[PDB]
Ligand binder design. Sequence first.
Ligand SMILES: *[C@@H]1O[C@H](CO)[C@@H](O)[C@H](O)[C@H]1NC(C)=O
Lengths: 126, 103
Amino acid sequence: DVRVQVLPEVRGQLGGTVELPCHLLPPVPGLYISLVTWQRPDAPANHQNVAAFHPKMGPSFPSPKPGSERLSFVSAKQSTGQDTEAELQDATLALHGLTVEDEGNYTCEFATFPKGSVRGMTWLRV
Amino acid sequence: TPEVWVQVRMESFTIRCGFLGSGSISLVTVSWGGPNGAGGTTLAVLHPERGIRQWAPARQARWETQSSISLILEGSPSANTTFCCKFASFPEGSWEACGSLPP
Ligand SMILES: *[C@@H]1O[C@H](CO)[C@@H](O)[C@H](O)[C@H]1NC(C)=O
């Protein structure tokens, strides 16, 4: 019923900025996104989780390897009060100051309640 | 480094798994035969507030602690059968491990 829309490959230029699109594409009533996680599966274990977004608490970048200085969520919104709900369906990542280290596979994964783990995979080249 | 543990035992049979990490759990997913959302067959989804969803082999699902779950499945599982548990946790991200019955 839901799928992750990613680009198969993203091409970037050294020192430049790129975006990695990721959308949980079919907006489905009653489907809740409890977390978004970006991973680099090819990395060592302690560097595999590179970005996360929580509905209430916003982003984390627990691996240093891209790290918080060069990585960001373009559109994900945390909830701002009891009135307004989080918006995690657009998990697109921006990566700045591209280096050769950033090349590889990236997986974007939504932890959704009824449906479970839903993921898509992109390869980034520099 | 966070750690996920998986224990598979014959009672029907039981899957137990838990997360040893530095943040709370946003979601647990359990799969048969491969990784959650990436090849495995989904057995259960557990959310701390929204509750439990489960699929046919899994007859019962529960939280044993705030960081661990238990599933009872009707069997049949082989010694070679893999079961995987994935924990989505902020701020550390998503962590998964897979286990099987003792041979
Ligand atoms: C796993 O074990 C069962 C029971 O012995 C057997 O039927 C099945 O072929 C085995 N699967 C693999 C992939 O070895």
